[PDB]
Amino acid sequence: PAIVNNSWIEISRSALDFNVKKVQSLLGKQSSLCAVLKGDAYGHDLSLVAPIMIENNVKCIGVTNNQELKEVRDLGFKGRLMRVRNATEQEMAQATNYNVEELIGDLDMAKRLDAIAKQQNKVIPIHLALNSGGMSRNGLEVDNKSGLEKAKQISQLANLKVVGIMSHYPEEDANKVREDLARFKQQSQQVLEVMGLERNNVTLHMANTFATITVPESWLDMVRVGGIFYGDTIASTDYKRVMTFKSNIASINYYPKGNTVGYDRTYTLKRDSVLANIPVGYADGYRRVFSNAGHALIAGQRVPVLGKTSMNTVIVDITSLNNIKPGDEVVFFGKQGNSEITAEEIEDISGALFTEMSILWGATNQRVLVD
Amino acid sequence: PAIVNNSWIEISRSALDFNVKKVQSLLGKQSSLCAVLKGDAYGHDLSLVAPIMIENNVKCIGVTNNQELKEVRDLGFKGRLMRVRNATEQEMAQATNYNVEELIGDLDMAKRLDAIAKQQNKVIPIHLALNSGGMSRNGLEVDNKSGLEKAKQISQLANLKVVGIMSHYPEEDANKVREDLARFKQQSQQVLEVMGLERNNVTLHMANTFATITVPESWLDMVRVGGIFYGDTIASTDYKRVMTFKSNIASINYYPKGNTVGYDRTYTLKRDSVLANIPVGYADGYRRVFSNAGHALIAGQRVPVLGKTSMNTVIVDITSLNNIKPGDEVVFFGKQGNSEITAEEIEDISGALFTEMSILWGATNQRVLVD
């Protein structure tokens, strides 16, 4: 007996499959695809999304946590499995269990990983992260002779193998991309030289979703793409959205003009009203940011959230609809009839990119594969 | 082999136990305690918190979702189990499996629940929610003769039993509490009268954490308290915080003056710098709201988050510390040495109450029972 969900997120298998096939088609036999499925596949559920990558013969996947790395192996993925962030010794020592290529951007961390590999009688594959793009996040600054000297020392560690060299773009702007690209191509060249590595045995990779779509020169040996799979990109509208966030009406309540709604009485009814009580609140990631601001879809029509969101309940005004029934389907993101809640309005209310919302919705609501 | 966590939330068993015992001591033999453990025990993990209630002989618990209701029964709770929101037919029909007292504030929903009880050959217990407090959320308006008539009709439904009558305060202000209290005491009286119910067979309850601490006259037959268990209340500082949110340093990176940090290069280094890369980001609920705003604790000292949070990584400035090592413990909420990150600064950065943060952190990071 499946437990009944207060709310749920539909994950369109056909949309994902479409998107995977489309990127694959765009690259062709150029470069190669690394599917970046961090953040629990950006809220879409690593359990749901990874098998779909595996069925499309994707050969490389990037995640961040040991849990994710374990899960991806458990789902039968056999190929190249990368961690797309710097990780701790504790993390990396356990993660040899899953044959992961780690991301190293500092010599001390390279020495510490090399000590772990010596301790386990292994040679551990790494991607050397450079700060060519300028993130000053995961990557080694190799702006000069002494940064290059650090890279040379990393190449002398007998129990690492450098299988890749990478950077990452700070700004989704085609021209800033082209600049950082030229800088990476120049720096990675010197790095290969000081490290004694053959360009043909080392995967060069810099591009993310925006670069992959916008700046074909970026593709290099491999692209690292994420948001592309969920139509989440400022660079195209041809990749399909994958999530639809739904619930149902728990009660339909009649209240007089003059009544107020919600904590601190922040919305006053201007008319006798009919209010839908929906069991979604901020514990479902429907945050306080939506208070007197959000909209939902009911009967194919956009209706407003009234007052402050509660932890587990939101109230929407249905006074202008009719023939609405308890149990009627409500949509908080996605399509219903000829209405839609868009990513863009979610960003504007929330004050942050949509990917943060999809991740936080995905963490707080059951995902169900559809289509 | 336990999977290594990128980050984790310590849940102090001793703090919770302290808080439970303290409320219990405050009420004594007056009223009674309903522990409200919705929102996954406000982010503290229903799996961890419920057994602690059960060991303290708590006799009544309130949650919201069927999953939670199932879990609380599965953990061996035998007592009075309430749903503290309006719920759908789908939800309520399944939830007889767990012997739940539902929350009904409309006659149609009362009729629909009564139809479900007739369909299952049961008499289903309910709490009749009134809108005395003014939420216009879960509760019946019984301001007059015709609202009272709806309550009379609810009392004529042969397959519900009214075991309780309740309201809820919109405003944590002692005087507004006292007002709403007088209104509830007056309305619930008429309601008992029109419904043919004996006051002695029906639990009256209105108080939440703030009312329970601030306005002793509120306690009535039962209090419904939540945030009290986690020291989460504007009404006292004597209840202990329960959560500590931790991670560790993944890499320590040296970068020149003039370098920038993070997406869109929003922070420029003013000096040669030493930066700690920590594997916590917005996928761990460390939202973009913390960009160039947050602080962490390292070596017992408060240090700033630099640039925009990434999905899985935050960078903090450690240039002013020394002898810092990879794997060193980092604290994002709670105490370390003689430094602290407080609930109040989390609210100010986030723009919302702390409970939303604790819930969203709890949804995106492993909880580990300590003490």
A289 neighbors B352 (Cβ within 8 angstroms): yes
B288 min Cα distance to partner chain A (Å): 7
What's the rounded Cα separation, in Å, for the pair A190 and A265? 64
CB contact under 8 A, B253 and A106: yes
- Pick the closest to residue B359 from B106, B24, B37, B22 (CA basis): B37
What's the rounded Cα separation, in Å, for the pair A121 and B301? 38
Cα-Cα-Cα-Cα dihedral sign, residues A318, A324, A327, A332: negative
Distances (CA, A) of A342 to A14, A24, A232, B175: 19, 26, 11, 42
In the beta sheet, which residues pair with residue A77?
none
73-112 in chain A: CB under 8 A from chain B: 85-91, 94-95, 97, 105-106, 108-109, 112
Phi, psi dihedrals of residue A124, rounded to the nearest 5°: -95, 125
* Full DSSP string of A263-301: GGG-EE-SSSEEEEEES--GGGT--GGGTTT-EEEETTE
3-class DSSP state of A157? coil
Pair of tokens at residue B89: 């037919």
CB contact under 8 A, B131 and A255: yes
Data resolution in angstroms: 1.7
Question: Which residues neighbour A305 within 8 Å (Cβ) at sequence distance 6 or greater?
Answer: A290, A291, A292, A293, A294, A295, A296, A314, A315, A316
Question: What is the dihedral angle through the alpha carbons of B27, B30, B32, B38, rounded to the nearest 10 degrees?
Answer: -40
How many residues does the structure list for chain B? Answer: 371
Active site residue B263: yes
225-264 in chain A: CB under 8 A from chain B: 248-256, 259-264
Catalytic residue, from B21, B254, B257, B263: name it: B263
In the beta sheet, which residues pair with residue A113?
none
Degrees (nearest 5) of the Cα angle A128, A134, A136? 70
What's the rounded Cα separation, in Å, for the pair B302 and B331? 9
Any B CB within 8 A of A130 CB:
no
- Ramachandran bin of B9, using left for φ above 0, alpha for ψ from -120 to 50, beta for the remaining angles: beta
Pair of tokens at residue B116: 């479900």
What's the rounded Cα separation, in Å, for the pair B195 and A1? 36
Active site residue A239: no
What's the rounded Cα separation, in Å, for the pair A66 and A205? 23
CB contact under 8 A, A89 and B327: yes
Pair of tokens at residue B61: 């618990």
Distance in angstroms between the alpha carbons of the first and the last residue of chain B: 22
User: How many contacts, defined by CB atoms under 8 Å, are there between A and B?
Assistant: 260
What's the rounded Cα separation, in Å, for the pair B369 and A233? 40
B229 neighbors B61 (Cβ within 8 angstroms): no
3-class DSSP state of B139? coil
What's the rounded Cα separation, in Å, for the pair A130 and A136? 9
A29 min Cα distance to partner chain B (Å): 30
Any A CB within 8 A of B134 CB:
yes
Domains of chain B plus CATH, in order, are 1-12+230-371 (2.40.37.10), 13-229 (3.20.20.10)
